[PDB]
């Protein structure tokens, strides 16, 4: 690999525009907030996207007896706490309107352990009035300027019978239109969008856009979900195990959908992938592994070519769709495990966070960039999906260099380093680990670091990087400005045992 | 090495009774308080011992004109702050009375960059009144029960001309007596001692105790310093380099001094080694190295056999005896470097801090203990003082183990791992590193961790441990209570690329 | 009032043995843990008592299909997190076993907005096994010594139909026996008790204790709830308004239940009042008022003469029994309001917290104590239950004192000071106030401080104290050790405008 | 007083552009950083200005033996920590080059307890190289863009014999030229100024600018100091008492100086008052008083009309020009006393910090502003320099109000409230107070808060404000948007003892 000294294109920040979260009511938890702080220190997402804003634990919508009439009462006690805590961590709501508040619901169908109601409202004017009240309260508390930077998606996965009664397309379009007109009636520059579908039903997007064009309904972006797992071939009381398609299958989804939009009546609409991961199940052990990290590295590297954002589902294991987690590593979606133990996928994100803007080189296994200070940062990955026992990959890089000498820092996560899941197993898989076992897992969960000085002969540094199975590695290369001549008389040979 | 299953002897906590510090005026620094918090978190010393309580930066003794007379004014502003901050970190003062305030000094001779005055008081009754005022202030602010746990040392190294005018033996005995009687006069339980002498003239200890015997002077303990370095053979504007004697020569020092006490009129006096380190210079690079940590490990394993406490000089590179530090790694005495970067010797101490009470085995290269919960903890070291390179040892441990499933955690510091000084050289030795260079040094300064599960064939576990040159390693061996049978149907072979 | 100079009687610490809380699942909230940290810093309770350990949000009990059979699974994820957080704040669980896990319930009846199921177990042996699993877990994680210090209550208000199917007395006695015997089977030193009833059916206490004697069921203490409000006479969509009885009526309940126990077959059983407040409704505005503070002071004053502990319901407005709070001050039981604004009652507890052990004087309006350092601390209160108006009381304290000069610090909470509820109404009663309005309510919630120096004649000081309507006041009287003579030449008359 | 409803003119933020500090070596103290954090939370200065950057405790300039010769060595260890800590608290240095490093000094004369050397350099080329090295290291560590916003002042009070050998004007101009030219040679955009003189010799400012015009020396700003105390009429071993000129005398200094600049060859140069206070002594008790707050308030109100910044000397009592402070309140210059106890003057600044941009009305006793949200903020003060008793002013504000219901919040500091000095005296003036005595003084140091709701009468609200002797008060008036009609059924009459 010959690395050009100059780039020309920029590597975009789309890969960290948004991250997913479990339902909004869980943001009230201290553990959730510990994990969000860690994520915002080490990664720094701009937006956060989750379900349940209008569900009943957050508690917004209630019907109250004042005399002999039921009247709506809007309780903002919890979401004011929640959004306050988001803004204090420099992250903003990617608002999702749903699910259906009980008192508004037209039927009983629910989804998840927490039972979000998945039926249309029994009265669409009550629904619009809910939407207007919530958007006006955001603007009252946080100001119009702030709330214009937010994003507003309507519903979640309406194409699926588990998420929306009868996967009724035309009723979803009615809910979309009522919600998007209500939002635009409070302020015309609020950004609203949909339809938030998952894969294998892309005509919904084309029908959605034809609907909004004909009926002149505002849409400011398209959203869609992307996963690559197949239906489980094995279930346990605890787990689903699923086969995964390769990362190219996911990147082909992004590209397919973008092509749908280009042929539509809104050819230039932003595309936001509002959930993605390998597996769509929150109890698939693959999410805890180094495989998951190496898999997601190619998405981070190329995803931004096709989409305006892609939101990893999720930043943390604080999640209740299938009940409270039953062991420390339980197959959860999170970048961060309970107790703030980063998983291998967490490090993939912090690695991409060290990259510069200027893109020098990219292929299917690496990306090489240049920073403002002139130094070079590269992330390399070795995704290996087969059962094999010794599938290393040598990469030789040839980096041009005017300096005399260079300092190289390399960080690695793989099946051996930065991998707390493997140590948790050597521990006997404790479900509810002691505080001491947890301190050990935190120590072990950190990337392996290696350093060297290298002299740069004939303008060039030669780097041969061996990548073990499912390794992701960051390599940073900086100019040594050597101060050693300043230490007049210095001689390590004068220290007992040295040089 | 076949490790017994039962102990008989305890391993004493003497090795962390006390640690040394730069002069007390430096405890006002935020950086000093940062390193102290780090050390108290990971090691947990009981006492802290430094110079300069009565020197002029701390400000206690002034003369002021009142009613046409020079009268003493005792300013407690700074040592109230200093001692309040020690008690907040659970550490107590091992109080050293010195050096001589300027307004009390009889002559002009000083020591150190900060100019402690090293001459007797112009008036011994003024000195006694100072001592009484200081001790009584301590009782008023902290209460008698707290202050009775502190210890009181008189002066420092009065056998060296640098530290006491003319190294005047009889003048020192006189200062001692006035000081000791002053302290006892405030409260009979306050423990006072001396003569705080360095190596090379232990006739001072026998004479000091003869003087106390004959003049009926209180003495509650004997204090002595120990170093193993020869006078410097090479000096730079920045460094002293010195040859070192092997660690046995320091343990002979402890033993010899203990013999001299047992031969004296006070045969049961506690012995405190109130400073020790390899080199007595605060500008000798050996202190920054893994050599220093392997050398110190031998001392921590056996020093407690001969003495009641031995105080490592010092917990921190916050130090000014030879002027402000001129580079990050400058030969300082500290366990912790500036920016709270732990040196190799810091880890030697945190490793001994994981050892249990019950001593199962000790030789010149390892110590093996058992904890209350039944786990085994061992520290091993490979000290190599020659310039060689081919001095990697191999150790075979046979450890009895009632369990049958074992989790082994190992931590390593050596020339490669946990070693910031080496990476600092790879960086070009920055004198004044950037924030990012400092964050990198903090990561690389962490011990390397390795873990495994092992089955215990025959109720014993055979470990073979390779120790590289000047490695110190902690090995912890704990019972697995395996929970994997409760994961009914678990099969990592069903995860893509896995078992 | 002449205050005796020496005491004889001790003022017990019983008043802060225990506090109440909202259901345990709420302890996962960051807001809860902020309020708890504030209460533990300023008051420092030993135990905390709440409902829902076994209810389904905490998630302990699940039935899971293990290939062929429905088997129990015990998920400790959440209560380990919760009990870890209590022990880090130095507070211990007063464990209440309840309510009924949905998967164990024999019928459908529930209580509260969070739906605790209130029916007996379908299988008493499954219940027993739940209990043994939970207690054994606590021991494994925290150790027997720690767990022996906790207390274990069985269910809650089983004499009320809303709390227990049919208020069925014999069914409750059976659940008790099964739970008590299960706890004793794990460890015999664990303390278990009941019946946790409210007022108005004290034959339950005599029947419970007769049941336990006849069947030799272990009982280690008796618990009882006490309130003085009548049933609501006015309801709003948001409030219950209730008339109160005077505080003597509550003290008469304490005394009465103690009398029942002394005539029982267990005449020496500890009595724990496991809940008390003025009103039993979490939506009665009286709880936010200065009236409530003056009413409770009387109880803190004397309650401990009759009972071993009395647990204020509750430490915080973080509470959901009647749904999420609909305004800042909404009649909540808490000492601390949302945003960690202390209500008037909080300050009544902080004031009793400045009292010494030595009891000098007490009557129905004041308590006077002497501290170990010799200083005097008194709390005085002017409870006025009538609609009256400028109802101002005068007290004259003749306080014996050897000193000669005294420093007096007085802190006042009343309808004017330390009263955020009154300022909140001045603000227009914002339901969901902005951050700036909150910082204001926090300022205004602080007690008013007044101070003076008084010269005290005849070993005696004369204190005349005006108390406004529903005022609570702390007065502290300290010896002045005057340092003014040391400021030779001081003259405030030499400062412009001063003396 | 009739306040107009509209403004046109803006009240500028000049009053908080810069604040003074004790010598830069003190910034290493934890206590200094505590006080700076408090000041930055509640006031928020942009720059900070102190002495001793080039003095020997900060340690930059050293001469070192390298082989035969004495070479310069620049030690940046300490100022890097210091400047890092400033920028972490969002405050930037107003760099002052001085005093003279010992090893560059041409003579022995020193100033202050800490002995800053006050003589010209022995070689002006070494000085230049010092200045070039310091400025280049700043740009290396912090970047040119950050450093371009800093200001660089040369020396301090060179017109005073105590500050500059012989008060030699031409040696000063020569030092200025060398320093100004060295700063520009590193980067021409850097802002350099002088001559940093105290009052009573403004001919120095005209000779200074005549010198710069004729010799073509860069000057980017003029600097000068302002004080109004006369020579001490009474001295104590610990105090100077001084008569104070009225506040107009200081505003007339500012206005006089700005007129000198306008008539000079550089008519558009910024004027920075780099130190001001009432007394120039750091042991004058007037600084701890409410008089000092009321005095300074007139300056904050108008000073900005004449000068670009005016820097209160100083933010904190962490100071050592006249030795360590001998008591809690010792007449020090600071806004914040030791233990982070705000003095009354601290509150004058936080009160001005509540003011809005738009100026409505200002006279010699008050200033009234409007904020962006429409609310009104006023600071009023009652400066009384004579010794009388009841010296109360009454002010009647008639406020134009577009509202209809108004919430009014007043904060008060005077001889009774917000005044820890008065209470410290009632305590017997403890020199070195306990932790409890300090906690009491911190409570008492808080401003007194009063609130009310007021109905706006015909378009207007009438306010009558009674100001006691030396009061400073903030009054904020905000629209009540009343939520009470939302509380359908609410009746405080239903709460026992209420409406």
Curated annotation (Swiss-Prot), chains A, B, C, D:
Source organism, top-level taxon: Bacteria
Protein name, UniProt field: Beta-xylosidase
Flavoprotein found in the keyword field: no
Molecular function GO terms recorded: xylan 1,4-beta-xylosidase activity
Residue positions of the active site: 157, 275
Matching PROSITE patterns: GLYCOSYL_HYDROL_F39 (PS01027)
Keyword set includes Aminoacyl-tRNA synthetase: no
Protein family: Belongs to the glycosyl hydrolase 39 family.
Record keywords: Carbohydrate metabolism, Glycosidase, Hydrolase, Polysaccharide degradation, Xylan degradation
Encoding gene per record: xynB
